[PDB]
Curated annotation (Swiss-Prot), chains A, B:
UniProt cross-references to InterPro entries, sorted A to Z: Glutathione-S-Trfase_C-like (IPR010987), Glutathione-S-Trfase_C_sf (IPR036282), Glutathione_S-Trfase (IPR040079), Glutathione_S-Trfase_N (IPR004045), GST_C (IPR004046), GST_superfamily (IPR050213), Thioredoxin-like_sf (IPR036249)
Ranges of residues in domain GST C-terminal: 84-202
UniProt name for this protein: Glutathione S-transferase class-mu 26 kDa isozyme 47
A Pfam cross-reference name: GST_C_3
One GO process term, biological-process aspect: glutathione metabolic process
Chief localization: cytoplasm
The protein's Enzyme Commission number: 2.5.1.18
Broad EC category: transferase
The species this protein was found in: Fasciola hepatica
Domain GST N-terminal: 1-82
PROSITE patterns per UniProt: GST_CTER, GST_NTER
Record-level Gene Ontology MF annotations: glutathione transferase activity
Amino acid sequence: PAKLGYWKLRGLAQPVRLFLEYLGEEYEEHLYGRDDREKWMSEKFNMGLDLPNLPYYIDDKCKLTQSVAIMRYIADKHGMLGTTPEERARISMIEGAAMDLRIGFGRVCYNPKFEEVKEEYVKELPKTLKMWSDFLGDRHYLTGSSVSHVDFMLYETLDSIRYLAPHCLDEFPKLKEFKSRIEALPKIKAYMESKRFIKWPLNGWAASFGAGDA
Amino acid sequence: PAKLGYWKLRGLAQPVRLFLEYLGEEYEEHLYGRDDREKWMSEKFNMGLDLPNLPYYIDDKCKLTQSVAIMRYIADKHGMLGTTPEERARISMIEGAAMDLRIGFGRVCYNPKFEEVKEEYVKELPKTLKMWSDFLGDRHYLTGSSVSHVDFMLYETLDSIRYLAPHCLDEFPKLKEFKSRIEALPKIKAYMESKRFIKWPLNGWAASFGAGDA
Ligand SMILES: N[C@H](CCC(=O)N[C@@H](CS)C(=O)NCC(=O)O)C(=O)O
Ligand SMILES: N[C@H](CCC(=O)N[C@@H](CS)C(=O)NCC(=O)O)C(=O)O
């Protein structure tokens, strides 16, 4: 059974964990916590990761790091990243704007004074989701008609704002229907109820928004 | 001739512009400026980019966006992103820590009070470059022995700190020799002197560090 490390936090281990349940890989999970930043620290340089970090992926064959890198290569195992250079480019281009989001926000989800930086950024939040949904146009999923790794990227970001921007999450139609579809899919849906799902937090205890223990 | 859009700024168009000169693609350049955020704004939704942004790449075949996405697909044209899923994963994993840098800093390069956030982060700066160079181990280039797209990513970030952390840029041996090698390579080196090279700034006029007109 593979292995996905990270602390009990939706952090950036959600899409990657979701992507595994969707593609039912019997993986193991290496959870972390607050009582364990040090419990982790000392280990950060043992599992031997060319570029240590979290979430880390341990395989009998590969030892990768980087949420995305820990997804991309797990997509090749199922050859999902397309085939033709053209189309193979549209898959990454998306994860580009899939991190553009979480990144442009992640920096602001642990700092005390996020609020100030939060206050006016919502001016652009509809804008980003203006082209994000406009782009979602009318298709079933991000890249066409079949759930690809990038789709859970953009999903966990939405259900992420569903906790501090619902007023605007509803502001956009298409993207609204979206959230439900992923929540619809088979084991994904069942996962969203299983004994091994991470509900709260969604950013990490040590933070003001989306953070917290319970 | 292809096309790479961005304002006269090393921004995130340097590695991608460098990667093209290395692989001598006869590209065109769509420069932007301060007198042109609006000159750009109005155009942001015309060249038809599923997910508008900068730097944008215009081809007769593909219209991509995202510095990296604008690089990856331009690597497939030269099939450089490896071949075996295993090795093909090590290429992205790197660009992961190639953005980890510029990102963990980019957020801090335009804000007035970066200094405060700059002050103590340098505590980790050696750490990151501790495993960044340790990883660079003893090989010619990041991914083995041949300059891949990820190599200019990590190069422009170093020559980026060469302007506000030299004290520490020297702190690390390996990575130190590095900067010179890229500067060594053929047309890359010649590019670092050509009539079409971007010297200053390296982050964007509207900013305190690395920014500025002249
Ligand atoms: N962009 C992230 C880079 C990693 C990252 O910054 N890791 C965080 C999550 S916010 C971690 O928990 N850091 C622990 C560490 O510094 O050792 C990725 O692709 O994994
Ligand atoms: N991570 C960047 C996302 C884009 C980005 O944030 N673009 C900036 C550069 S700092 C741009 O100049 N923005 C113009 C815009 O908002 O239209 C990428 O891959 O291109």
